[PDB]
């Protein structure tokens, strides 16, 4: 790989520079290189990996949605025929998005998850696995759509089981996992009631635990709780 000749510490340093420069494709490439050194990632390094790929895939998802909307409008009655170009370009962006998801899933499978023994690392990686299968599911339309959805579900469910046994209800990883699994239920699995129930139980059980936290931890937890609330407000 192109990062094979660069020191691990230099890749981490450059990932942080890339973040400051808003160069998220570079950041992701540096972090992929760091993962491929074969050592486990620290908490800070896991969050660099996550931030990098979430920005890359986020731009692709936003572009895909724009193009898919244009493509859908073109297929309405009365719309003038414009040729294959919209479909082709949507497919191009889709294929690149799927490639990024496959890259992330590949890092998780080789070998981040299997080496992750602490609850914080294992939940973090399983949540990421669910997220990137969810992004695959957002664009899926073929024979394997059900299996992609079930792969997301299974990863989230394993992460949830560990998080509930091993982390307090205010832990920000646990909260973000529950937030994302609730989005999965609402937007992927056609299960809005499950989404709402999960968001409300998560919020309430975190509320009840805030009293145990320092001011700084309280801020971290309440930020994600507000996102749960925002979704509940959208959905109800």
């Amino acid at each position: 790989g192109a990062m094979g000749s660069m020191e691990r510490a230099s890749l981490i340093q450059k990932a942080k520079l890339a973040e400051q420069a808003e160069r998220y494709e570079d950041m992701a490439a540096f972090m992929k290189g760091a993962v491929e050194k074969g050592e486990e990632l620290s908490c800070e390094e896991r969050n660099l990996l996550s931030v990098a790929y979430k920005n890359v895939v986020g731009g692709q998802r936003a572009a895909w949605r724009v193009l898919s909307s244009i493509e859908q409008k073109s297929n309405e009655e009365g719309s003038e025929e414009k040729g294959p170009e919209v479909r082709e370009y949507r497919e191009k962006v889709e294929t690149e998005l799927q490639g990024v998801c496959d890259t992330v899933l590949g890092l998780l499978d080789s070998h981040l998850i299997k080496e992750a023994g602490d609850a914080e690392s294992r939940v973090f990686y399983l949540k990421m696995k669910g997220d990137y299968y969810r992004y695959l599911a957002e664009v899926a339309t073929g024979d394997d759509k059900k299996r992609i959805i079930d792969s997301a579900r299974s990863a989230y469910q394993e992460a949830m089981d560990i998080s509930k046994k091993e982390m307090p209800p205010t832990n920000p990883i646990r909260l973000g996992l529950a937030l994302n699994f609730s989005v999965f239920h609402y937007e992927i699995a056609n299960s809005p009631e499950e989404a709402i129930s999960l968001a409300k139980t998560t919020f309430d059980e975190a509320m009840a635990d805030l009293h145990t936290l320092s001011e700084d931890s309280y801020k971290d937890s309440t930020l994600i709780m507000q996102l749960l609330r925002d979704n509940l407000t959208l959905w109800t």
Binding site: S50, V51, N180, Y186, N231
Partner: peptide, 9 residues
């Protein structure tokens, strides 16, 4: 809907 994520940096 809102999904999770901020940078520690």
């Amino acid at each position: 809907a809102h999904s999770s994520x901020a940078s520690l940096q």
